[PDB]
Amino acid sequence: NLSVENAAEILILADLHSADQLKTQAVDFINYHASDVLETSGWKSMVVSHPHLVAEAYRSLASA
């Protein structure tokens, strides 16, 4: 049920509830679909609201 349009928001909720598997799935999805996710309002809002989660996605993408 991850989608380009919900992925940033799912990452925020996975983090909020310490849902490690879901968090990992969301980060991996975002990385795989970065070109599209970056154009979403969910992502743009996450950059401001939860910058640490952008940093976490970055860390994962860098270690790939």
Add this chain to the structure above:
Amino acid sequence: NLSVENAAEILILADLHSADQLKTQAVDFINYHASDVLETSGWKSMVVSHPHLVAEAYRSLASA
């Protein structure tokens, strides 16, 4: 003169002064040295102060 310890701070100053070449050099350096840059106080402070710049580094790393 880019270093692991100054790279995030240089990215902030490149952005502040719209110094495109320096910004690109800084992002590329950060991406290449991500494992080390992520452990710096400059990076950690940038995540909070300039989250858009973390997003810009992410966008570049993703398009690599």
